[PDB]
Structure formats: structure tokens, C-alpha cells
Amino acid sequence: DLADRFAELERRYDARLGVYVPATGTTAAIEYRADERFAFCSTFKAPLVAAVLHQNPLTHLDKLITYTSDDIRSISPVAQQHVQTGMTIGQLCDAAIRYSDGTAANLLLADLGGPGGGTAAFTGYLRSLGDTVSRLDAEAPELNRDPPGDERDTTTPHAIALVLQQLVLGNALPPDKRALLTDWMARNTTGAKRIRAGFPADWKVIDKTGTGDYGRANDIAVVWSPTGVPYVVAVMSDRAGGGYDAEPREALLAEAATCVAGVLA
């Protein structure tokens, strides 16, 4: 039994696990703690890039953004390397998705603009997709730090799966912008040990990870079977019992995804 397997994983990793896979043609929704709140961590960067793409002509990708030493406030593998030159909006989107670059995401939030350094507009974009649950309140590094149970900077597996479904499979974005987001997620460098590890090699996986304090580890993905049938997979986890410095456990997400893959095969 699937719920029993997920509960076993929670005990193994001293964790809270949330899983959602939306219903399809012939599969029922898979849900486990799917309506409980979990921190977004970096998973918000997928709809953030969608928001920025949607808001602007495609050639806004070519606009150069400059930034300074005091803008590097978080893990930023790309933005740290390019600080002496600036980065284009396209480069920022690439870094935000594929390297989970914190500075890149903060700069994209500022590009979206408005109150809260762009967080209010980001949340408004989610509202436009029918998501009345999620909320973004802070940028990096603060957004990964809210205490367990706090609702700031949270989504739910259910909510973010429905958002990702509209972005990648549905018509939230025009096809050209949809393809840009899809390709960046396809080329992600940070997800090999999460949902990807749970699906056989002949399934296509695109994803966006997130990792935070209190042992937070998330992954959101779109997967395609060897015959081209797509599923959206959201897996979220935290380890409040280990406190602020609890280690995130990717293996929990790999095992959860393996259980999901077993059902979808």
C-alpha cells in the first residue's frame, strides 16, 4: 500500500513527506500530505521564470542586468562568476532554474517588480493560475529559513503540482515561452538524486529542486513515459525533529519517486 510505504519513509528519515501526482486519463491522483504546507525553497523559481517570461516580450531575455557585491547574499554558482559583467535576463533564468542560483532569482524577482521586492507580484502570478494557497514573502536567503509550520514562503504538493501542470503541459504560457521553461528544466543540473533517481532511464524527467533549513528537500517534475504520457510529480520534505541544521535527505525523495514510478509503470 502506497500510503504505508510513504509512512515507512517518514520513519526511516525522521521526516515529514508530501507527495502529489494529479489525476490523468487512467490514473487517480496520488496524494500523501498533499494539502499540508511545505516551504517552497527553490521550487518557486520555476513559476518565477514563467512569470518573467509571461510579463515581457521574448527579447527581454536579451536585456543586461547589472548587480554588485552586496547582491550576493546566498548560494549563487553562476551569478558569483559573472558579477564583473552583469547577466542577461535569459542568463538569469538559466541560472535560477539549472543551478538554483539565489542571486539570479532575487534579480528576477526585482525585474518582476512591485512590493516586497517582487514577491507580491510573484504571488499574484500564482493567483492568476488559480493557486489560492501558495505565498512568497521573502527572497533569498530568508525564504528557506521560516520555522517548521510557519506559513510564510510555503506551497503544498497539490498546489505546486497544479501550477507546474499548467506551465508545462497546459496553456499558461504561449508555446515559445513554454518551450524555454521546459528546456531549462530539462537541462537542470541539481536533480539527479531526486525524482530522476526514481524513474527508469527510458522515462524523460524535467525538474526543479529546492533545499532549505530544517532538513528541507523538495523536487517538482514533469515526467513522460516511454510512450509519451506525461505526469506531474511533486515531492516535498522536511525534518523538523533535527532542528535548523537538520540535514536534507535526497534519498527520501528518490525512494518516494521510486514508489510513484512503480504505480505509474
UniProtKB/Swiss-Prot annotation:
Domain of life: Bacteria
Protein EC: 3.5.2.6
Modulation of this protein's activity: Is inhibited by clavulanate.
Residues annotated as binding substrate: S100, T209, G210, T211
GO CC, alphabetical: extracellular region; periplasmic space
Processing after translation: Exported by the Tat system. The position of the signal peptide cleavage has not been experimentally proven.
Bilayer-crossing regions: none
Subcellular location(s) of the protein: Periplasm; Secreted
GO aspect biological process, one term: beta-lactam antibiotic catabolic process
InterPro entries (alphabetical): Beta-lactam/transpept-like, Beta-lactam_cat, Beta-lactam_class-A, Beta-lactam_class-A_AS
Site, Increases nucleophilicity of active site Ser: residue positions: K45
Annotated site, Functions as a gatekeeper residue that regulates substrate accessibility to the enzyme active site, chain positions: I75
Catalytic activity: a beta-lactam + H2O = a substituted beta-amino acid
UniProt KW keywords: Antibiotic resistance, Hydrolase, Periplasm, Secreted, Signal
Subunit structure: Monomer.
Family the entry assigns: Belongs to the class-A beta-lactamase family.
More about this protein: The class A beta-lactamase family has a specific amino-acid numbering system, sometimes called Ambler or ABL numbering and often misspelt as Amber. A multiple sequence alignment was used to derive a consensus sequence and then the consensus was numbered taking into account insertions and deletions. This allows use of identical numbers, e.g. for active site residues, despite differences in protein length. UniProt always uses natural numbering of residues, hence there appear to be differences in numbering between this entry and some papers.
Name of the featured protein: Beta-lactamase
Organism whose genome encodes this protein: Mycobacterium tuberculosis (strain CDC 1551 / Oshkosh)
